[PDB]
Ligand binder design. Structure first.
Ligand SMILES: CCCCCCCCCCCCCCCCCC(=O)OC[C@H](COP(=O)([O-])OCC[N+](C)(C)C)OC(=O)CCCCCCCCCCCCCCCCC
Ligand SMILES: CCCCCCCCCCCCCCCCCC(=O)OC[C@H](COP(=O)([O-])OCC[N+](C)(C)C)OC(=O)CCCCCCCCCCCCCCCCC
Ligand SMILES: CCCCCCCCCCCCCCCCCC(=O)OC[C@H](COP(=O)([O-])OCC[N+](C)(C)C)OC(=O)CCCCCCCCCCCCCCCCC
Ligand SMILES: CCCCCCCCCCCCCCCCCC(=O)OC[C@H](COP(=O)(O)OCCN)OC(=O)CCCCCCCCCCCCCCCCC
Ligand SMILES: CCCCCCCCCCCCCCCCCC(=O)OC[C@H](COP(=O)(O)OCCN)OC(=O)CCCCCCCCCCCCCCCCC
Ligand SMILES: CCCCCCCCCCCCCCCCCC(=O)OC[C@H](COP(=O)(O)OCCN)OC(=O)CCCCCCCCCCCCCCCCC
Lengths: 172, 96, 171, 105, 318, 345, 98, 115, 83
């Protein structure tokens, strides 16, 4: 129960490896949905739940529109999942073996202390205010409404200009 | 009705937070004393029994500032049990 | 660097309250109004001197006044306070709104005996200006020498000598 | 280049959240507020090469607070020596460190 | 004791959805001047069990042109998301108490949409592809509308929790303060559950069976269980959010009874809607939402931003 | 088009670099870069031909990848120090990734391959807007971190950009590709002088901008796309020829044109910092740049290529040339060498 | 935390390698871009939560907004590419070399 | 830990149900049974050809509006602020520009399913 | 105006959703500017005590701040009590 975040980070690494290995975009969206859920779990484990749930919802909508588009235009008669080429599977397991090799090397080389096998799960949350109200994530995202109105207005203008941009691109 | 009831709930929240404020110094004193007790027992257990390596200082800090640096969760529960460390890391988060 | 100093178990020993959170919250308002001087002295020393190792006497005084307050509560009238804090202990949030009747009986107890008045809606949540004789720490954060700034040049702004002095440009 | 319309007009669009020790939402801190405060107060007015030279003590303390490499190495050394002594049978942990302790509030 | 609590949450929900199938067939029959099943059970009460046994004793019939991994993953995903969505509901005390309960609900609903999409694409058939694309359009429209509705209603509430909704509706419902949001939320729950009028994903008339047209018995039963569990859940969420049951600290049994009565009424309302209305076109559903509900809910979201500010009725944080 | 979306898109094109150069937070610099990219894409794909679509796609994926690397550098700096600016003690790996990604944003070699591709297949005014306005925000970020840059990587990128730009402009016959390779060479000069003097790269940027604004304006006047199209300019607009030749010579760096001034002062500063090898190699490849400019001058001004019959109708009709923009910039980009101490700052 | 941050940095590196190495699919390239975006979001969120930088907590939301804007623009460009050719192939869009 | 156990129990329940569904009945598999359905005839295409959806602009607008949703969602904590005037103005501006974008797209016929 | 009234009545008959949305938008703009309770929301959020009130030293030169919570000095919340 100490290495839970490390297991999640390894799963995120595997999902990003599959996305890099580039299946058919159906399975690419699947891998990105899995990676988004895993990253949500990592953020929730590290702290406030609002950021993880936000990135989960956002990537759910994004990969849904992506699924629609890869059905519409980015498709082929035989969409390769991962086993159309044995090189893709061999490279996936090669990357997994390289990941295990590098983390074993960095555990053996414990001078810097980036990854430690004995010290894993000991330095996840550093210092927390034990007694205290209104210290969770989402209060800062609310402070975007009052303390970073410049961040709020550049995000809003980005979305507004983006509406105009996409209409003019797909005007045809 | 929502205006009146939300104002009443604001008054109730102020009452609860004032009860918390009145209980704050006792919790602060007990928390500081417990933290110092854990640090002292860690320092003694590192001091007498743990370290006989010739090049080692027992109570050596890692800062030159010579003032109080509050301890980390992994610093104060590092010598404790793994279940206690996991409770200190993921107690509030997993309690749902 | 240096060896960090921290007190021993003998000077960290104190008579702990051993009192649950629900009974603490039931007695919170009268505890906060009875000895607010001791609690504010502890908070003032704690926020002035950031070191917890130099406020242990104030913390023991906070524990002592809390113990005296609870001993007065236990001595004078105990069963309406008991039923009040158990009604608070029943709920999942210890909401004061559930058991105002037992709160009224406990307030009647502490008003008839010991003459205590429960604070109003916005009284416990303001600054206090506590008087103390402990000297003000002149160097919090253990700051270093703060090295002096650059020696700013003062004088009249004369024109540049012989113009720009850029190759063959005379002016 | 770097225009300074924020300093010229006196506004602060993005200047109050440049670093950790700067205007937390309700009243909170950022776990190295004192160290970052000391480092910035050291480096102000002498900035650049002089701040890199003669604020190295404050910067090293702040970097140690933020990254905790030396605390990790010290704790790893203590735990490694403890495990070596457990293997050699020369150490028995106390009750409070391993198992039942007396809980204080 | 916690596993016993999980059982007492999960098993009654599954029996409730099976008898929801029975109640749907009987209510539709009695609105169609006929009866429901009354032969299999004493009053038809064994009909869902007979249907379940027949579906689980028919062969699943894996097809040739089919991505088998997604074809198997999708119905199990749908059922586990339906039960996971049932987890955090308070009646009046939830099994799992979440601070961001509504956000959890939204995330799980979107993942259920992904289950439908993956089933439709994996069952490599044209009607399945049609059903998947219709699901994409439908979830676009109701997702944006539902997010705005929940934002405004929980702005009238305090945090994103649901016990806070109970304490908010302790004195009066939320239907009277925000009834247009309740109407648009009811329509959005219909769209989320893929129910009539705008089902459009299992469209029996436009398509053959939509995304289930290649799913034989077994995983088809899993999809049906997930759909009807989601029906009961959306009605339960609507009555928790808007039609607040009576809550007393001394006894919660009357809260559970009131919640049961209102959830049964809204489920019967869903069956009533199915009996009453014909189907939309799936472009007409998008036009209807994006041209009627979205501007009105944007305006009402602005109104519910302004309302606690100018009435000073800002809800507490806790 | 539509005036409302024209105003929105052009205001966002303006707003991107302004936010980047006026914001002290690296995150706000990144959102300014994002503003510039996303705003300029619909202006690129506007004619809706396959070449415009390809150019927009290439530009989008290149700038998106570079901005993602920039954001990686910003997040790693925030992890290391907790601030939102590279102050003094950041990691050299972070700084080198920042430099590499901003080089791919700018388009200098060996990240230069997309720039002639994108500039080709795009209308001339959009090529002008790209090659001038899009290169200020990454240069502003590079000027902001004026120390703490790797001079080795800077000089390698500078020398390879000048070499590849000279060779590419030597090969090309398309005018837009010629302008893109000129951009690559001048960006190489600016990047070369960047870690030693921000004033000199600002000066070279200003000289380059005021030099290639009227070049693009003169291309825009007759919609001249190729060397032959600019060659039949004596029949179309014979008054253009002297200013065209003088601006091409100034882009070549010939004295006494004011385009000699940025190369001269950059060589001076590099002499002051003892980089004679780099300065000499840069000057020789600048001579190569001047060669392909001089071939262009031979085509358009000093000889008279054959013309066709319909240019008689072109002479019959009347034209329109922008006041206060072409002639002013041409004069200031040709005959402003004796104001060199005023130009340097 | 340092092990998790190393894993997130390696995940970003893998998604960058996916972006740089094309396999016949502009949609897959956009997917790799959004994988890089997700890795950066998780890195920023974990850093802010670890350092208790609640004032800097709007930064992940800002990068998510601008990332979805760029994903929107990329999807629009992919639509135009598909309308031009009908296959969405990065090797098929190559005619600007001359 | 509790929520994790409930999630795993639901997943194991769904897996148990589909494993029962696959190992319980009798299997008789042949080619005409497992062929794709296509209403009682052989399919002309492979059901993997491009589909050419007609609401692509609405989908991209949905992406942008979903991120506007993500911006609007911290309002329940935003209304607890001490200023509340800049908060109210900022919320009004955000909702107004979102509505202006929707109105502009409606006027320019963006959400009209161009065939 | 006759044309404006006829246009509004036709819009209310034919498209009574845009009319309601624009009216609600205008009402949400106008109502905070005319309500007498607008300052009360900010004052309530100010008076809500999420943090400990840190005491100050007694130099004897400030008579405005109280010496104890049971004092007439300080920001009393009788406006919220009677609100
Ligand atoms: C480290 C452990 C983490 C996992 C990595 C190692 C194991 C998986 C390696 C990748 C396998 C890819 C593969 O074979 O794909 C082919 C298959 C597609 O094959 P198929 O289904 O088209 O064909 C199989 C046909 N038969 C059975 C007749 C031979 O794709 C998948 O399995 C991907 C499905 C999703 C997997 C992840 C689901 C997570 C939960 C979602 C909710
Ligand atoms: C959960 C609680 C219960 C909820 C209700 C449940 C029971 C009733 C169920 C009825 C059947 C529903 C089945 C599905 C029906 C689908 C069709 C449908 O509903 O379409 C939506 C229809 C659409 O109608 P339409 O599509 O025919 O409209 C024509 C539009 N054109 C021409 C462009 C196509 O109606 C709406 O969109 C209205 C939504 C609700 C509006 C509520 C407004 C309330 C008043 C606001 C304030 C007014 C005053 C202004 C200010 C004054 C200040 C002083
Ligand atoms: C609703 C939740 C629970 C759902 C699952 C249902 C639980 C209750 C199930 C009770 C019945 C269990 C056995 C069902 C067998 C159905 C298939 C069948 O009859 O196969 C006949 C076949 C007969 O096999 P066979 O030897 O005649 O050969 C089959 C091939 N032919 C006929 C062409 C020669 O299999 C069995 O009899 C297997 C019996 C297994 C019993 C397990 C208990
Ligand atoms: C068929 C395959 C299916 C795969 C997909 C499974 C989907 C599951 C259901 C949908 C989940 C959506 C995302 C939900 C995340 C959790 C929501 C949440 O808010 O969690 C936080 C919560 C505690 O937070 P809070 O409420 O703030 O409490 C603090 C004080 N009470 O609680 C926590 O902190 C608990 C954290 C863990 C909760 C999730 C556990 C998931 C376990 C992995 C499932 C998948 C495993 C892989 C596949 C297995 C084989 C098929
Ligand atoms: C390291 C950089 C080189 C990686 C090479 C990977 C295999 C390869 O050659 O990929 C090229 C391929 C090009 O695309 P494609 O359409 O498949 O072309 C077929 C070529 N005739 O492109 C692809 O298939 C995309 C591959 C993306 C891979 C991203 C993840 C990389 C993980 C491994 C990192 C390096 C590990 C080195 C290990 C060495 C041995 C221990
Ligand atoms: C600040 C602005 C935003 C505030 C919040 C409100 C958000 C509203 C978002 C949508 C607004 C779009 C308005 C323009 C538009 O696109 O109208 C289109 C509509 C005709 O389109 P449609 O209904 O599809 O018709 C098909 C063929 N007849 O056109 C019509 O139906 C004509 C409608 C004319 C009347 C409009 C409403 C006037 C209300 C005045 C109230 C004063 C009090």
């Amino acid at each position: 129960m100490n290495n839970y975040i490390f297991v999640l980070s390894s799963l995120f690494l595997v999902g990003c490896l599959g996305l890099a290995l580039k299946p058919s975009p159906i399975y690419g969206g699947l891998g990105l949905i899995v990676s988004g859920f895993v990253g949500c779990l990592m953020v929730l484990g590290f702290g406030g739940s609002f950021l993880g749930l936000m990135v989960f919802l956002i990537y759910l909508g994004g990969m849904l529109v992506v699924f629609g588009y890869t059905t519409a235009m980015a498709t082929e008669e035989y969409p390769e999942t991962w086993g159309s080429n044995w090189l893709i599977l061999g490279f996936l397991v090669l990357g997994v073996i390289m990941e295990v090799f590098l983390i074993c090397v960095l555990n053996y080389y414990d001078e810097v202390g980036v990854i430690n096998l004995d010290g894993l799960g000991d330095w996840l949350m550093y210092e927390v205010d034990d007694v205290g109200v209104m210290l969770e994530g989402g209060i800062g995202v609310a402070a975007m409404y009052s303390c970073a109105t410049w961040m709020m207005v550049v995000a809003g203008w980005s979305l507004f200009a983006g509406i105009f941009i996409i209409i003019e691109i797909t005007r045809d | 009705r929502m205006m009146r009831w939300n104002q009443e709930r604001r008054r109730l929240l102020i009452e609860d937070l004032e009860a918390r404020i009145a209980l704050m110094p006792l919790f602060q004193a007990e928390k500081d004393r417990r933290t110092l007790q854990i640090l002292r027992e860690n320092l003694e257990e590192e001091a007498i029994i743990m370290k006989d390596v010739p090049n080692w200082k027992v109570g050596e800090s890692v800062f030159h500032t010579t003032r109080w640096v509050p301890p980390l969760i992994g610093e104060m529960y590092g010598l404790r049990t793994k279940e206690e460390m996991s409770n200190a890391n993921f107690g509030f988060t997993w309690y749902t | 660097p240096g060896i960090v100093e921290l007190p021993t178990l003998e000077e960290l020993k104190v008579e702990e309250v051993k009192v649950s959170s629900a009974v603490l919250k039931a007695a919170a308002h009268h505890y906060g109004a009875q000895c607010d001087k001791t609690n504010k002295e502890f908070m003032l020393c704690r926020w002035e001197e950031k070191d917890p190792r130099r406020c242990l006497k104030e913390g023991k005084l906070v524990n002592g006044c809390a113990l005296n307050f609870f001993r007065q509560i236990k001595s004078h009238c105990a069963e309406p306070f008991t039923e009040y804090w158990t009604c608070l202990d029943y709920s999942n949030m210890q909401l004061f709104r559930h058991c105002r009747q037992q709160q009224a009986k406990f307030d009647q107890c502490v008003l008839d005996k010991l003459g205590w008045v429960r604070p109003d809606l916005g009284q416990l949540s303001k600054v206090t200006k506590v008087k103390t004789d402990r000297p003000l720490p002149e160097n919090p954060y253990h700051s270093r020498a703060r090295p002096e700034p650059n020696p700013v040049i003062e004088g009249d702004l004369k024109p540049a000598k012989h113009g720009t002095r850029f190759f063959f440009w005379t002016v | 280049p770097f225009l300074d319309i924020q300093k010229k007009l006196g506004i602060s669009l993005d200047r109050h959240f440049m670093f950790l020790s700067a205007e937390q939402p309700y009243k909170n801190a950022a776990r190295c507020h004192a160290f970052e405060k000391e480092w910035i107060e050291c480096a102000h007015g002498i900035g650049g090469t002089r701040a890199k030279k003669e604020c190295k003590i404050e910067f090293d303390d702040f970097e140690e607070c933020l990254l905790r490499y030396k605390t990790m190495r010290r704790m790893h050394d203590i735990k490694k020596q403890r495990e070596k002594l457990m293997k050699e049978g020369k150490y028995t942990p106390p009750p409070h460190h391993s198992g039942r302790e007396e809980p204080r509030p | 004791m916690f596993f016993i609590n999980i059982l007492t949450l999960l098993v009654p929900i599954l029996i409730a959805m099976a008898f929801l199938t029975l109640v749907e067939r009987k209510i539709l029959g009695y609105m169609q001047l006929r009866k429901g099943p009354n032969i299999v059970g004493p009053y038809g009460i064994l009909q869902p069990f007979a249907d379940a046994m027949k579906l689980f004793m028919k062969e699943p019939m894996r097809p040739l042109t089919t991505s088998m991994s997604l074809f198997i993953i999708a119905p199990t995903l749908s059922l586990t998301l339906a039960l996971s969505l049932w987890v955090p509901l308070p009646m009046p005390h939830p099994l799992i108490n979440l601070n961001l309960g509504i956000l959890f609900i939204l995330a799980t609903s979107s993942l259920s949409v992904y289950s439908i999409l993956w089933s439709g694409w994996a069952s490599n058939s044209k009607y399945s592809l049609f059903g998947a694309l219709r699901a994409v359009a439908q979830t676009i429209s109701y997702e944006v509308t539902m997010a705005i509705i929940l934002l405004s209603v929980l702005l009238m509430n305090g945090s994103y929790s649901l016990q806070t909704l109970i304490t908010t509706q302790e004195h009066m419902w939320l239907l009277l303060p925000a009834w247009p949001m309740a109407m648009m939320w009811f329509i959005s729950t219909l769209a989320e559950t893929n129910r009539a009028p705008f089902d459009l994903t299992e469209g029996e008339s436009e398509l053959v069976s939509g995304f289930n047209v290649e799913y034989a018995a077994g995983p088809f039963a899993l999809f049906f269980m997930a759909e009807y569990t989601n029906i009961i859940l959306m009605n339960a969420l609507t009555t928790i959010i808007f039609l607040g049951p009576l809550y007393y600290i001394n006894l919660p049994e009357l809260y559970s009874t009131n919640f049961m009565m209102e959830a049964l009424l809204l489920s019967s309302t869903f069956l009533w809607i199915r009996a009453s209305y014909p189907r939309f076109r799936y472009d007409q559903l998008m036009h209807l939402l994006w041209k009627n509900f979205l501007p009105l809910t944007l305006a009402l979201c602005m109104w519910h931003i302004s309302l606690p500010i100018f009435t000073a009725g800002v809800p507490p944080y806790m | 088009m539509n005036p409302i979306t024209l105003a929105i898109i052009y205001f966002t094109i303006f707003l991107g670099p302004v936010i980047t150069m006026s914001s002290t937070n690296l995150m706000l610099m990144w959102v300014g870069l994002e503003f510039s990219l996303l705003a300029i894409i619909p202006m690129l794909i506007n004619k809706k031909n396959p070449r415009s679509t390809e150019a927009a796609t290439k530009y989008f994926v290149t700038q998106a990848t570079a901005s993602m690397i920039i954001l990686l550098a910003i997040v790693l700096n925030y992890k290391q120090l907790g601030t939102w600016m590279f102050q003094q003690q950041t990691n050299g790996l972070i700084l080198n990734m920042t430099l590499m990604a901003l080089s791919m944003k700018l388009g200098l070699a060996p990240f230069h391959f997309w720039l002639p591709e994108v500039t080709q297949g795009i209308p001339l005014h959009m090529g002008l807007i790209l090659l001038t306005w899009q290169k200020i925000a990454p240069l502003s970020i590079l000027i902001q971190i004026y120390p703490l840059l790797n001079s080795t990587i800077i000089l390698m990128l500078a020398i390879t950009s000048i070499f590849m730009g000279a060779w590419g402009g030597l090969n090309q016959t398309q005018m837009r590709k010629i302008m893109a390779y000129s951009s690559i060479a001048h960006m190489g000069w600016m990047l070369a002088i960047l870690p030693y003097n921000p004033s000199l790269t600002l000066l070279n940027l200003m000289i380059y901008i005021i030099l290639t604004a009227p070049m693009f304006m003169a291309l825009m006047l007759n919609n001249s796309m190729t060397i032959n199209s600019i060659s039949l300019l004596w029949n179309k607009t014979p008054a253009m020829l002297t200013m065209i030749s003088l601006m091409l010579l100034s882009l070549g760096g010939l004295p006494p044109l004011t385009g000699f001034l940025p190369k001269w002062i950059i060589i001076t500063e590099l002499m002051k910092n003892n980089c004679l090898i780099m300065a000499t190699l840069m000057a020789m490849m600048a001579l190569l740049n001047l060669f392909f400019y001089t071939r262009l001058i031979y085509s358009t001004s000093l000889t008279m290529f054959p013309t066709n019959n319909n240019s008689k109708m072109m002479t019959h009709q009347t034209k329109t040339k922008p006041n206060l923009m072409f002639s002013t910039l041409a004069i200031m980009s040709t005959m402003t060498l004796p104001l060199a101490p005023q130009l340097i700052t | 935390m340092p092990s998790t941050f190393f894993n997130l940095t390696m995940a970003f590196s893998l998604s960058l390698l996916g972006t740089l190495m094309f396999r016949s699919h502009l949609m897959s390239t956009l997917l790799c871009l959004e994988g890089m975006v997700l890795s950066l979001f998780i890195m920023t969120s974990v850093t802010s939560l670890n350092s208790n930088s609640m004032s800097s907590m709007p930064i992940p939301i800002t990068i998510l907004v601008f990332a979805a804007c760029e994903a929107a623009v990329g999807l629009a460009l992919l639509v135009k590419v598909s309308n031009t050719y009908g296959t969405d192939y990065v090797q098929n869009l190559n005619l600007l070399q001359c | 830990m509790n929520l994790y156990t409930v999630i795993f129990i639901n997943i194991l329940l769904s897996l148990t149900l589909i494993l029962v569904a696959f190992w319980l009945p009798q299997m008789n598999l042949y080619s005409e049974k497992a062929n794709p359905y296509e209403c009682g005839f052989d399919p002309t295409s492979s059901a993997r050809l491009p589909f050419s959806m007609k609401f692509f602009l609405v989908a991209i607008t949905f992406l942008l509006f979903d991120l506007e949703i993500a911006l609007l969602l911290p309002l329940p904590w935003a209304i607890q602020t001490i200023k509340t005037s800049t908060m109210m103005i900022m919320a009004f501006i955000l909702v107004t520009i979102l509505s202006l974008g929707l109105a502009y797209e409606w006027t320019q016929k963006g959400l009209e399913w161009t065939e | 105006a006759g044309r404006i009234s006829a246009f509004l009545k036709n819009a209310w008959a034919k498209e009574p959703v845009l009319v309601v949305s624009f009216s609600v938008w205008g009402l949400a703009i106008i109502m905070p500017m005319i309500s007498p309770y607008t300052k009360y929301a900010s004052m309530i959020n100010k008076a809500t005590p999420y943090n400990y009130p840190v005491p100050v030293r007694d130099d004897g030169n400030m008579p405005d701040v109280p010496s104890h919570p049971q004092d007439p000095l300080g920001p009393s919340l009788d406006w919220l009590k009677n609100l």
